[PDB]
Structure formats: C-alpha cells, structure tokens
Amino acid sequence: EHAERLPYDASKWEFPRDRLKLGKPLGRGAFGQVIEADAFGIDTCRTVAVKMLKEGATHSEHRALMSELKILIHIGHHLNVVNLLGACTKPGGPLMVITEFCKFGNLSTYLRSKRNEFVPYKVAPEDLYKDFLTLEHLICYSFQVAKGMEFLASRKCIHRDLAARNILLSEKNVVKICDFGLARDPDYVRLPLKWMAPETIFDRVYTIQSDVWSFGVLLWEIFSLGASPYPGVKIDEEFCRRLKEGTRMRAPDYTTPEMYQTMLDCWHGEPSQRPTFSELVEHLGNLLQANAQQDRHHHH
Ligand SMILES: CNc1nccc(-c2cccnc2Oc2ccc(Nc3nc4ccc(C(F)(F)F)cc4[nH]3)c3ccccc23)n1
C-alpha cells in the first residue's frame, strides 16, 4: 500500500494549471469533482477530464487522490484503460489528475441510447444504417474490455467493480476501462451485488477470477444494449440462494448463441473453472474476426 509515496516523474507528468480551460462539470465524488477541460500542449488542443481535490479536504482524502494518481502511473498505458495524460501537483492550486476525455461517456447509457439504431449487420445500401450499432460493434467492445482486463491482470491488478457503467466510449469505437469509485446509487446496495461473484458476496473474496464473473455480467449488459442486470428480481437473500444453486440470467435480446455461452462460462460457480481473460481475448477475438469477415459482399 501507500502508493502515494512512489517516485513522481514531474518532467513526464506535471502539467501547468494555466494551460487548462475549465468547462462543464462531469461528476462529483467524496474527493471533489471531475470537470471537462481543454488542455493546450498536454501531449495542440485536447479535451480532457480533470479530477480535482476539493478545498478543505482531509489528509486521508488528499492521500487517496495522490494514491490514485500513482496507481494510474504504476499500471501504465493501454488502449483499453482510461489514459492518464497529466497531473497538477505543485503549489499554487488544487491537486488535479487529468485523463483523456471519452466523447460518448459510459457504455451502459450509450448502448441504451442506441436501441432504435441497431441492426445485427448492415446490408447494402448501408446508408440506411448510418451510425448504427451492429453485432460486430458489440463483440468488438467485448473483445476490447477483455484485452484491457488481460492487461490489468498482467500488471497484477484486480478491478473489483467491473460493469458497463465503468466502461467509457471514445471515438473510433475504442472503449476504456475505468473506476468511477462509486463503491467508495441504485447499482450499489448499502456493494455492486448484481456484478459480484458468489464467493465475493458471501466471503468478500476478490480475485481476477471474480472479475471474470463481473465480465460475464458486463457481457449481458452489452448484449441487452444497456439493460440493468436481473430484471424483475429483488437483490436479497433469495437472489443469493438461487445464484449459489446455479440460477443465471436468461439470454439478452441482442445476443448470439456463442456470446450467451460465454456469459454462462464466466458465471461458473467454481472460480478456477471460469475462463481466464487471456482465454476470453482469444475466444472473443476469434468470434470478432468471424463476424467482421463473413460477409463477402464487398470482396469479389
Ligand atoms: C463523459 N466522458 C468522460 N470521459 C472521460 C472521463 C469522464 C469522467 C466523468 C466523470 C467522472 N470521472 C470521469 O473519468 C474518470 C474515471 C475514473 C477515474 N479514475 C480511475 N482510477 C483508476 C484506477 C485504476 C483503474 C484500472 F485501470 F485499474 F481499472 C482505473 C481507474 N480510473 C478518473 C480519474 C481522473 C479523472 C477522471 C476519471 N467522462
């Protein structure tokens, strides 16, 4: 622990506060707030999201945000993990942590907005389906999250709150894993129980294999175009009993048979019998390739 104590390469990370144009609020937490900004010369102009420590923060709050900064630095860069771009740590203003802005926001809300703009696959004339989501998009998002999680695992990380609300969508259909820190809201019971593996619910065990369970729930979210898990079910002791017994969600409205089986696999009762993220990357990549290449219309 005590990640805040890690060496800080200021030449790499430090960004001048006066090179930010602060814009609309994006969200608030115990730390302070996250606001949209345009940053000049952070890499040109680039839109970013800036998490800033509130004035009058406690030592523990301040330590927590610095720890977060150091954790993001330690993990390192991956396409599918929200990209840390800079920080403002020196005297003269608040502690600020700067990440890339993702135009389309969280994946759950985005997918929900596209329910009248989805077709399994385009057919010519394709302009009838301009900016529509397809199965190819959904498998692509799934593959990317698996890639991100594979990367996090290789960094010896465990996410602990994997869910569609914690995935951000940028341009060029690139998705990014984040942690909005909502554990520290209707998705959280005073714990994100709907996303938690049975060993996590009953025994507070968190491993990369419980993240795999959560990934299964995330897949269900994707292939339902942003529905809330376990429709029509109160999340109480009977829910937990039935989960232990082997009851699982039914196939969502937009799934393929293969994708549903993958959900079921992720939801194995035994952590060791669930696929690894490496296996998921392989499997999903193969499913994506098949999907992306199967229509030979334009390939005479
Ligand atoms: C609407 N578009 C958009 N684009 C980018 C960011 C946001 C955003 C909006 C409201 C609140 N937070 C937002 O972004 C963040 C998410 C998570 C953050 N923190 C975070 N801390 C993390 C630590 C670890 C990992 C792991 F990679 F392991 F998954 C991911 C983590 N994510 C942010 C930190 C600083 C600034 C923004 C952060 N919103």
Q: What CATH number does the domain containing 47 carry?
A: 3.30.200.20
Domain end among 63, 81, 101: 101
Residues in the chain: 300
| Span from the CA of 148 to the centroid of ligand 1 (angstroms) | 14
Cβ within 8 Å of residue 101, ≥6 positions away: 36, 46, 47, 48, 49
Residue closest via CA to ligand 1's atom 36 equals: 51
Residue 132 CA to chain centroid, in angstroms?
21
Query: For residue 81, which of 3, 13, 156, 159 has the smallest C-alpha distance?
Result: 159
* Pocket flag, ligand 1, residue 161 (CB < 6 Å): no
**60 and 111 belong to one structural domain:** no
* Pocket flag, ligand 1, residue 169 (CB < 6 Å): no
Burial class (CB in 10 A: 0-12, 13-18, 19+), 98: buried
Instruction: Give CA–CA dist 47/190, Å, rounded.
Output: 35
* Farthest-apart Cα atoms in the chain, separation: 66
Helix axes 135-154, 208-222, angle to 10 degrees: 170
Q: Is residue 19 part of a domain?
A: yes
Q: What does the block give as tokens for 269?
A: 């009762």
Instruction: Give CA–CA dist 265/212, Å, rounded.
Output: 9
Give the range of the structural domain holding residue 82, as residue numbers without chain letter: 1-101
**109 and 92 belong to one structural domain:** no
Domain end among 50, 66, 101: 101
Resolution (A): 1.6
Residue with token string 């695992």? 153
The closest-lying atom of ligand 1 relative to the alpha carbon of residue 170 is 4
Q: Which residues are catalytic?
A: 161
**Among 51, 81, 104, 177, residue to substitute to test ligand 1 (most atoms within 8 Å of Cβ):** 51
Q: Is residue 192 part of a domain?
A: yes
Is residue 22 within a helix (H) or strand (E), and if so which, with residue range? strand 20-29
Residue closest via CA to ligand 1's atom 9 equals: 26
* Pocket flag, ligand 1, residue 84 (CB < 6 Å): no
Which runs of consecutive H residues, i.e. helices, occur in 42-197?
59-75, 107-112, 135-154
| Span from the CA of 180 to the centroid of ligand 1 (angstroms) | 6
**276 and 248 belong to one structural domain:** yes
> How far is the CA of 59 from the CAs of 62, 198, 202, in angstroms?
5, 35, 33
Q: Is residue 295 part of a domain?
A: no
* Pocket flag, ligand 1, residue 36 (CB < 6 Å): no
Count of CB atoms situated within 10 Å of the CB of 6 = 14
* Pocket flag, ligand 1, residue 81 (CB < 6 Å): yes
Domain end among 101, 126, 145: 101
| Span from the CA of 178 to the centroid of ligand 1 (angstroms) | 5
| Span from the CA of 41 to the centroid of ligand 1 (angstroms) | 21
DSSP for residue 254: T
**241 and 267 belong to one structural domain:** yes
> How far is the CA of 188 from the CAs of 35, 90, 105, 185, in angstroms?
24, 35, 20, 6
Residue type, 226: G
**187 and 221 belong to one structural domain:** yes
Residue with token string 């608030």? 28
3-class secondary-structure state, position 127: helix
* Pocket flag, ligand 1, residue 49 (CB < 6 Å): yes
CATH of the domain at 145: 1.10.510.10
**203 and 247 belong to one structural domain:** yes
Instruction: Give CA–CA dist 102/167, Å, rounded.
Output: 10
Burial class (CB in 10 A: 0-12, 13-18, 19+), 274: buried
Q: What does the block give as tokens for 120?
A: 């399994």
**Among 178, 182, 206, residue to substitute to test ligand 1 (most atoms within 8 Å of Cβ):** 178
Asked whether the bond before 125 is cis by omega within 30 degrees of 0, the reply is: yes
DSSP for residue 50: E
Method underlying the structure:
X-ray
Q: What does the block give as tokens for 75?
A: 């993990």
**148 and 3 belong to one structural domain:** no
